[PDB]
Amino acid sequence: VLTYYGSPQQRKEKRKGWNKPDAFHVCIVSYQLVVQDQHSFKRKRWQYM
């Protein structure tokens, strides 16, 4: 489980490695960051939402 929250520098530090297969099983994120960071989530494919 990846908890995607924090200030942008640590936020992008948490992004590091997201593209690798099986880097994580589930990601949990808040709607504020979804409206903030939409590009990152939209680029990845998220199976069951």
Next chain:
DNA sequence: CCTTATGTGATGGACCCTATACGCGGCCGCCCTGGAGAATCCCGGTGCCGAGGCCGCTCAATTGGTCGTAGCAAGCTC
């Protein structure tokens, strides 16, 4: 005047002691070596929404005619 051998009185020199290079070692400038890492480079790799293409159509660019006076050609002259 001839004729020994040295007085006269300084500039020229050897010396005392000074202070120094450096054996072994360190601070430091520096070559460079060295790592960690803090950026920056280029290539995807993707999903978005505008560039630009297509069509409907209208009004103004184009046309042929007319009128007339602004630019042109001497060319005089100062």
